[PDB]
Structure 1
Amino acid sequence: QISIRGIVGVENVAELKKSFNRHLHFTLVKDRNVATTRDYYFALAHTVRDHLVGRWIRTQQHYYDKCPKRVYYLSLEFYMGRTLQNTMINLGLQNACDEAIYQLGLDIEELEEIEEDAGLGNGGLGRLAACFLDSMATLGLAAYGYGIRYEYGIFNQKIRDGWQVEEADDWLRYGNPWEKSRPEFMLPVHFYGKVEHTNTGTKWIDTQVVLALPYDTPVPGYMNNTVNTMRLWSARAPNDGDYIQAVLDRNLAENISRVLYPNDNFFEGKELRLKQEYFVVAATLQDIIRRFKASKFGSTRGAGTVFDAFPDQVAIQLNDTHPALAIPELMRIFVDIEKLPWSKAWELTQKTFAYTNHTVLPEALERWPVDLVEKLLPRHLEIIYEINQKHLDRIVALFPKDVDRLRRMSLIEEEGSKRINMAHLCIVGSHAVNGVAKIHSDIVKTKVFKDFSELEPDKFQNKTNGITPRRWLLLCNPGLAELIAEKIGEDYVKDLSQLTKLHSFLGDDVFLRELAKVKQENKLKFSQFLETEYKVKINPSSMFDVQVKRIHEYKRQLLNCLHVITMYNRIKKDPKKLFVPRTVIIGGKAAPGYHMAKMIIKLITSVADVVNNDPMVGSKLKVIFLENYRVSLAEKVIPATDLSEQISTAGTEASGTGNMKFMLNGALTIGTMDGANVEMAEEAGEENLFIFGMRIDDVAALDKKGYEAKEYYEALPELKLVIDQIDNGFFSPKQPDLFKDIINMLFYHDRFKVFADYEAYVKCQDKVSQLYMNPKAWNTMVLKNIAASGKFSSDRTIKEYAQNIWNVEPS
């Protein structure tokens, strides 16, 4: 990275200070005598952005000059977090900027903390897109992310009287120094209208128009010359009763990009959401085609622009089914506008698109009513019906007698209200389909889409998820990054598999102590934060037991809560008995319409109030509901964690990525054999994780036999006490019936079988406590996790997409 001492190094810092002062003066228009911390943040942000402009421009020129095949990552979500520190690190500028800011008499941490998260995602899906952008830039791929510039991202969460409340995430209030508005590149998007079938062919007419205006954010590679782009579209009314009302009604078009739908793993079939999906797809495809036509591969024949080489120059990855409309939109452009024959257009379409499936939970599946699609996108409905007809004609030819197979494989679900199965659309319109962990990809291929995989074996793949070690180690845990570098060099950042070199320090007491010291420093720093936000006295010798992720029945924060109450009851039963102290932290947002998740939050805060204030418990056990969990807060809590809770019901968590973050940062994992937890066990050795509970076949057996929650309740005395306390008002004395809905769910409607894993979970937790009392054995197991975490770099993931799906090479 850029030097700070010596002749040149002194000048580097000098220039940065000069640029900072120039921005404060000319850009912010403030004298130092009236400037605030926020002004200083913005002055530094502009200074840092200026430092990547040369590479950003040169990267665009390079892609134009050499025509590498381009990768377009199309997603409704990019969960980017804060940009300042990540950019400084990737540009090799952090040391120099740190020094400049220090010499100016300012506190760099304070400036960095001013920045709002770009919270343009819900959880793992959106964050995967963000990690992927970093990795694709670091590997030199010609890759752009395309999404929506929501005016409001994921809501800011507060807790009031123990319940979640939502506030608007007004992240653009003070502006965004990391985007460049580019209205000259605006493109039209059409809605409603009708289809006309005339002598000149099929026309989509009488439509309403909304403009898509792009905003570009730079995506710097780690220590290279690549600066890629994230292009996010914002909706505007076209410029073309009551004049005043007509002007105000421009708000209706602009509402398309107003707010991120705050649902994680849950389908809500709202018209505004469908508009968002078509909006991002239509603007993105027009932009991609425009760039292709301007490129050196752009050429024209009698029949118009030649698209033969389009899939040799363009790969589009569909992040879940949310941008599934890209398939019929590309066909619409090829057939209605460019006049290609259907067969040729369909062939080009399949070669262009690949689809990533991110969940098998039924409630998450996009099934759009046909009548809604007919109203909003009539031509796309026609095109989808035609795709389905030609799809089913092939199936009839292959399997003349199998009538049910046609029903199973149709893109249309015909019962009651007819709906479009967007996953089926994505499968037939793409050349590759992948899941996000071995266990999940297998379920996708061999169970959920069995009929499709049988006819096209080689279509279905696995690409196990990953995380970027820039944000999720170098940035969030500089202490650990430094320790690792001291022992094995700094080449691990670009090749994370080099972490296996840490195995040379097995049995090295000095290293095991240094590792523990890093964790302790992180815990002390985070404990400062906790004690300023919450009325709690944190026991500094306690095990930090952490479950942070979106609040879900399938992720089973509720199971964790049952264990918290169990520990509480053991303490009250035997005050003098040995207890390994814990700070139990549970955090995450509930989708605002998700009743059971909101009840689970209230249960946790209610339990916390009892546990934290019981003088017989004291420093043995404290419980924190960590508010407003999001990317920047994840960067704080993850490095401070000793035990990572990854306890989804086997078969429900497609991959997980929080699990990987915790593993890389020195926490041990308690979890089920679900998602990538299975592969973490493969890499580190199963005995080096705290694995428990039903596996996917055990869940299947219990489903076959039939799940009777009451049997576990009657059989397990400790469970009985916990449940009776919750049901009878022990945790809600002013409102004894408060948790009725949770009890009813647990006993009669628990699709995720909390009680069935309780016994194994509590036994497993007891083993965790035992190991924690032996620091040498604890930290030895930690070392074995960190040293085996290399597979989970998103650089590895991206190389696999590049080689086996996109057909592009790292550069």
Structure 2
Amino acid sequence: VAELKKSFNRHLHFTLVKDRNVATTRDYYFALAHTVRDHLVGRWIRTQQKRVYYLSLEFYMGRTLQNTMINLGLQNACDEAIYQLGLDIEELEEIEEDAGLGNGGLGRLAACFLDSMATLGLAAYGYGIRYEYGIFNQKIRDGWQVEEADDWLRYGNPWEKSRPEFMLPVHFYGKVEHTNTGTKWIDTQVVLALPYDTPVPGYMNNTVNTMRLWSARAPNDYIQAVLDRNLAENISRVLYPNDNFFEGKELRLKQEYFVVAATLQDIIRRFKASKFVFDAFPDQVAIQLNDTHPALAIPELMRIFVDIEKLPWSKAWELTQKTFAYTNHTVLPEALERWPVDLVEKLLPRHLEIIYEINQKHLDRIVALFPKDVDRLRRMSLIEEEGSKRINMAHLCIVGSHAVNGVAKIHSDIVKTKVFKDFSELEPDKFQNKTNGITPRRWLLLCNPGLAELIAEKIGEDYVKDLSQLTKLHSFLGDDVFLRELAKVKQENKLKFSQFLETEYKVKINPSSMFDVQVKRIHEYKRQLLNCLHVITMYNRIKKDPKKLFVPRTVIIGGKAAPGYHMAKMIIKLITSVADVVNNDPMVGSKLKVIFLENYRVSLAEKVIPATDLSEQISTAGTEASGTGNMKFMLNGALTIGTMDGANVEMAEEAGEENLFIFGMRIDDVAALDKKGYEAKEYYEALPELKLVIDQIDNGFFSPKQPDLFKDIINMLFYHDRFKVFADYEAYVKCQDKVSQLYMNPKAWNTMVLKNIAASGKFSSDRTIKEYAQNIWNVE
């Protein structure tokens, strides 16, 4: 403890240039971060000197100090030293800005994968773009959504480390010149790529992997010419905000090309400097593509093999196929990347030529087998020419990889059988399944220390490594003291989150109330509108007769929206209006409060997840591939309600469908409704409560100033409904009534909570990473 205090004081003195009489809390935080980095740096150095290379455009890391101290096993001594110094740890932690470099589940899964590979001892690297601005910081002004820039690097970064040695040139634009010896790509602008190294420690395993982020620079080759160096740096400037939607901008194509080029050149440099010549490259380099975003890594690797290395074309394509593995995350038609040919030709002419060459070879190979198939010729191509010609990047990832994945069992089946039937039937073993997972360290040990300690008191500490040990908690279903203590830790977390909520939102929180939380990105397919309709329903139920007993229920809905997405903004406005009406009704009192959680992120989830009682995953069945939020909920002692979709099917299989509240129509029923013809007015006319709620929304009950504030939402619900909000309202209300009736009995509620806890060990990210290593990457 004395050594850590001396190190902290020395870092305050020399590194910060400060004394105890002037240092702010930010300086103390920086000193603590520097001393924990000094604690990890020796093993980081030792680890730096087959390998996996994970290539994502997003890494939703969050906050580092607490996770690093948990993974290093230095919490007791550090907390004791901070106490003896005379400081609090909560404000020091709150000083740190989150690395909000991911939009949502994809980047969060990438970060969990990095933590799992570090914990399992694998030799892996992370690769991405060092965005100076994350998603954004969200604030509610006049009940609306306003976005402000997220400057997470203004005050410094005590974790990353620039590497001047490994700066690489990335070329843009130009022309193709044909010569006898190779193909020449010339007249190109050069953009520099500067790497920054962020450690990724493993839990108690002496392994510190690396997260390398590429920072754009300018070549040094007049004032306006100096002010135009920002255009080269305009890539790596700001993370794009779309969660699933695909824009099609010339920017973010430069970002994709920049990251894939820099990463491929860095790995090739690392391989050439090894003892290993390119016939062993697929045996030493496995490149995992998170989504269709790093799809240009296939033609770029082809360009390096065929032009810079002048390898034979056939061998180069063989090595590229043996090196790449593909993972699919979305199925939504508007969520699929299709870059127009003209934009790529302007930006990447050599890559467009390589894409045409790969397409021609693949089409000839397919037409050899199927002389009769003419429509298959158009279907299986890498180019779509219905209007303007566009490049199906998913097809390019398919043909260029030796594996293809889905994020869930249902999603894997859909992509293999429905989405990519033509590719799958020819290559049956290529298409596989890997169900997502969440790291126990960040989401149980860091997120919920009380529940983690309670579990460790029963089944030991071995569950951290392998989450499947949670099944040993089934032996404690008979005991009642354990259920009481479980409810007690839930109530303690609820009290802490209520302390947060009261100060932050100026609303009094009933502490015995059920915490009903729905945190996710605001999408139409995620159906926050159904939750809004339900809260208006139970508000009207309270208004009808206050004599009847009601369940004390706190409703929390928090998530960001795309800045250009109007309907999500309208849904946020409706949530804020309903919260304003319901919170300020004397008749309701402490029966129904609606809080719109603000600036939802990893750090905020580390506080709202361990206090949740009911989880809302009510997306339309067949529209969600897989979400990791419900896994965190199920891990942190929360009962889940929702549809049979995404990871909900796996959770219902693992714990039992009777231990979850499953409502709504299934995928087959959704398809049957689509075939029959969906009309929302018929559902509207046949329900009194739903009709009352919709009429109140339309009649300006929540918008006294503008009578037509929610006409957009009303028209979307009635005449252009796409995700069947009305067709699931009846089942949603019935299951919410069942939830309320079950909450009245602590015994049954705690029994189902224990059943969900003991059956969530499957959804660890260690399991997913082991499947990835032993079935795709072929490492260890």
Please report how far the alpha carbon of residue 698 of structure 1 lies from its aligned counterpart in structure 2 after TM superposition.
0.6
Q: What's the secondary structure of 2:524's corresponding residue? A: coil
Q: Establish whether residue 163 from structure 1 lines up as the match of residue 137 from structure 2.
A: no
Please report how far the alpha carbon of residue 715 of structure 1 lies from its aligned counterpart in structure 2 after TM superposition.
1.1
CA distance in 2, matches of 1:198, 1:639: 64
CA distance in 1, matches of 2:396, 2:517: 39
Please report how far the alpha carbon of residue 669 of structure 1 lies from its aligned counterpart in structure 2 after TM superposition.
0.1
Cα RMSD for the two superposed structures:
0.8
CA distance in 2, matches of 1:402, 1:318: 31
CA distance in 2, matches of 1:311, 1:396: 28
Q: Establish whether residue 542 from structure 1 lines up as the match of residue 513 from structure 2.
A: yes
Please report how far the alpha carbon of residue 342 of structure 1 lies from its aligned counterpart in structure 2 after TM superposition.
1.1
Please report how far the alpha carbon of residue 720 of structure 1 lies from its aligned counterpart in structure 2 after TM superposition.
0.7
Q: Establish whether residue 88 from structure 1 lines up as the match of residue 59 from structure 2.
A: no
CA distance in 1, matches of 2:227, 2:667: 54
CA distance in 2, matches of 1:268, 1:507: 54
The answer on whether the counterparts of 2:182 and 2:310 sit within 8 Å (CA) in structure 1 is: no
Please report how far the alpha carbon of residue 48 of structure 1 lies from its aligned counterpart in structure 2 after TM superposition.
0.2
Q: What's the secondary structure of 2:235's corresponding residue? A: helix
The answer on whether the counterparts of 2:104 and 2:243 sit within 8 Å (CA) in structure 1 is: yes
CA distance in 1, matches of 2:162, 2:469: 40
CA distance in 2, matches of 1:247, 1:778: 65
Partner residue in 2 for 1:56:
44
Match of 1:737 among 705, 708, 715: 708
Unaligned runs of 5+ in 2: none
Q: What's the secondary structure of 1:462's corresponding residue? A: coil
Please report how far the alpha carbon of residue 264 of structure 1 lies from its aligned counterpart in structure 2 after TM superposition.
0.4
CA distance in 2, matches of 1:216, 1:128: 20
Q: What's the secondary structure of 2:493's corresponding residue? A: helix
Q: What's the secondary structure of 1:734's corresponding residue? A: coil
Query: Residues 237-261 of structure 1: CA distance to partner in whole angstroms, max 9, x if unpaired?
Result: 011xx91000110000001000000
Q: What's the secondary structure of 2:603's corresponding residue? A: helix
Please report how far the alpha carbon of residue 336 of structure 1 lies from its aligned counterpart in structure 2 after TM superposition.
1.2
**Aligned residue runs from structure 1 range 254-273, under 5 A:** 254-273=233-252
Query: Residues 193-250 of structure 1: CA distance to partner in whole angstroms, max 9, x if unpaired?
Result: 11111233311110001000000000000001100000000100011xx910001100
CA distance in 2, matches of 1:784, 1:613: 38
Query: Residues 656-688 of structure 1: CA distance to partner in whole angstroms, max 9, x if unpaired?
Result: 000000000000000100011100011111100
The answer on whether the counterparts of 2:52 and 2:125 sit within 8 Å (CA) in structure 1 is: yes
CA distance in 1, matches of 2:86, 2:202: 30
**Aligned residue runs from structure 1 range 454-493, under 5 A:** 454-493=425-464
CA distance in 2, matches of 1:409, 1:336: 27
Query: Residues 502-539 of structure 1: CA distance to partner in whole angstroms, max 9, x if unpaired?
Result: 11110211100100010000000000111111121111
Please report how far the alpha carbon of residue 184 of structure 1 lies from its aligned counterpart in structure 2 after TM superposition.
2.0
CA distance in 2, matches of 1:736, 1:391: 58
Query: Residues 552-590 of structure 1: CA distance to partner in whole angstroms, max 9, x if unpaired?
Result: 000001111110100101000111111001100000000
Match of 1:669 among 622, 629, 640: 640
Q: What's the secondary structure of 1:585's corresponding residue? A: strand
CA distance in 2, matches of 1:140, 1:368: 38
Query: Residues 640-665 of structure 1: CA distance to partner in whole angstroms, max 9, x if unpaired?
Result: 10000011110111110000000000
CA distance in 2, matches of 1:695, 1:762: 17
Q: What's the secondary structure of 1:463's corresponding residue? A: coil
Q: Which moved more, 1:601-610 or 1:746-755?
A: 746-755
Q: What's the secondary structure of 1:311's corresponding residue? A: coil
The answer on whether the counterparts of 2:29 and 2:92 sit within 8 Å (CA) in structure 1 is: yes
Q: Which moved more, 1:242-251 or 1:364-373?
A: 242-251
Please report how far the alpha carbon of residue 140 of structure 1 lies from its aligned counterpart in structure 2 after TM superposition.
0.5
Partner residue in 1 for 2:177:
196
Query: Residues 418-437 of structure 1: CA distance to partner in whole angstroms, max 9, x if unpaired?
Result: 10010000000000000001
Please report how far the alpha carbon of residue 111 of structure 1 lies from its aligned counterpart in structure 2 after TM superposition.
1.0
Q: What's the secondary structure of 2:17's corresponding residue? A: coil
Q: Which moved more, 1:163-172 or 1:196-205?
A: 196-205
CA distance in 2, matches of 1:308, 1:77: 31
CA distance in 2, matches of 1:109, 1:728: 46
Q: What's the secondary structure of 1:461's corresponding residue? A: coil
The answer on whether the counterparts of 2:612 and 2:638 sit within 8 Å (CA) in structure 1 is: yes
CA distance in 2, matches of 1:743, 1:233: 45
Query: Residues 116-169 of structure 1: CA distance to partner in whole angstroms, max 9, x if unpaired?
Result: 000000000000000000000000010001000000011000000001100000
CA distance in 2, matches of 1:676, 1:688: 15
Query: Residues 353-387 of structure 1: CA distance to partner in whole angstroms, max 9, x if unpaired?
Result: 00100010011100001100000111111111111
Q: What's the secondary structure of 2:80's corresponding residue? A: helix
Unaligned runs of 5+ in 1: 1-12, 62-68, 298-305
Please report how far the alpha carbon of residue 95 of structure 1 lies from its aligned counterpart in structure 2 after TM superposition.
1.1
Query: Residues 9-33 of structure 1: CA distance to partner in whole angstroms, max 9, x if unpaired?
Result: xxxx111111100100000010010
Q: Which moved more, 1:665-674 or 1:722-731?
A: 722-731
Match of 1:243 among 183, 199, 222: 222
Match of 1:40 among 20, 24, 28: 28
CA distance in 2, matches of 1:571, 1:79: 41
CA distance in 2, matches of 1:642, 1:201: 64
CA distance in 2, matches of 1:156, 1:520: 30
CA distance in 1, matches of 2:154, 2:479: 51
CA distance in 2, matches of 1:20, 1:738: 55
CA distance in 2, matches of 1:295, 1:694: 56
Q: What's the secondary structure of 2:245's corresponding residue? A: coil
Please report how far the alpha carbon of residue 624 of structure 1 lies from its aligned counterpart in structure 2 after TM superposition.
0.4
CA distance in 2, matches of 1:355, 1:555: 26
Please report how far the alpha carbon of residue 618 of structure 1 lies from its aligned counterpart in structure 2 after TM superposition.
1.0
The answer on whether the counterparts of 2:132 and 2:238 sit within 8 Å (CA) in structure 1 is: yes
Q: Which moved more, 1:196-205 or 1:327-336?
A: 196-205
Q: What's the secondary structure of 1:209's corresponding residue? A: strand
**Aligned residue runs from structure 1 range 307-326, under 5 A:** 307-326=278-297
CA distance in 2, matches of 1:609, 1:52: 48
Please report how far the alpha carbon of residue 102 of structure 1 lies from its aligned counterpart in structure 2 after TM superposition.
0.7
Please report how far the alpha carbon of residue 182 of structure 1 lies from its aligned counterpart in structure 2 after TM superposition.
1.0
The answer on whether the counterparts of 2:384 and 2:392 sit within 8 Å (CA) in structure 1 is: yes
The answer on whether the counterparts of 2:182 and 2:306 sit within 8 Å (CA) in structure 1 is: no
Q: TM-score, normalised by structure 2?
A: 0.99
Please report how far the alpha carbon of residue 110 of structure 1 lies from its aligned counterpart in structure 2 after TM superposition.
1.8
The answer on whether the counterparts of 2:54 and 2:127 sit within 8 Å (CA) in structure 1 is: yes
Please report how far the alpha carbon of residue 717 of structure 1 lies from its aligned counterpart in structure 2 after TM superposition.
1.3
Match of 1:554 among 485, 509, 525: 525
Percent identity of the aligned residues? 100
CA distance in 1, matches of 2:545, 2:419: 50
Please report how far the alpha carbon of residue 416 of structure 1 lies from its aligned counterpart in structure 2 after TM superposition.
1.1
CA distance in 1, matches of 2:20, 2:721: 60
CA distance in 2, matches of 1:759, 1:347: 55
The answer on whether the counterparts of 2:175 and 2:349 sit within 8 Å (CA) in structure 1 is: yes
CA distance in 2, matches of 1:694, 1:346: 45
CA distance in 1, matches of 2:326, 2:14: 47
CA distance in 2, matches of 1:729, 1:661: 38
Please report how far the alpha carbon of residue 711 of structure 1 lies from its aligned counterpart in structure 2 after TM superposition.
0.8
Match of 1:436 among 387, 407, 410: 407
Partner residue in 2 for 1:103:
84
Q: What's the secondary structure of 1:308's corresponding residue? A: helix
Please report how far the alpha carbon of residue 183 of structure 1 lies from its aligned counterpart in structure 2 after TM superposition.
2.0
Query: Residues 603-629 of structure 1: CA distance to partner in whole angstroms, max 9, x if unpaired?
Result: 000000001001111100000000100
CA distance in 2, matches of 1:194, 1:615: 72
Please report how far the alpha carbon of residue 786 of structure 1 lies from its aligned counterpart in structure 2 after TM superposition.
0.6
The answer on whether the counterparts of 2:515 and 2:614 sit within 8 Å (CA) in structure 1 is: yes
Q: What's the secondary structure of 1:72's corresponding residue? A: strand
CA distance in 1, matches of 2:252, 2:234: 11
Please report how far the alpha carbon of residue 96 of structure 1 lies from its aligned counterpart in structure 2 after TM superposition.
1.0
Q: What's the secondary structure of 1:212's corresponding residue? A: strand
Q: What's the secondary structure of 1:158's corresponding residue? A: strand
The answer on whether the counterparts of 2:145 and 2:572 sit within 8 Å (CA) in structure 1 is: yes
Please report how far the alpha carbon of residue 748 of structure 1 lies from its aligned counterpart in structure 2 after TM superposition.
1.7
Q: What's the secondary structure of 1:145's corresponding residue? A: strand
CA distance in 2, matches of 1:139, 1:33: 45
CA distance in 2, matches of 1:689, 1:143: 37
The answer on whether the counterparts of 2:516 and 2:553 sit within 8 Å (CA) in structure 1 is: yes
Partner residue in 2 for 1:21:
9
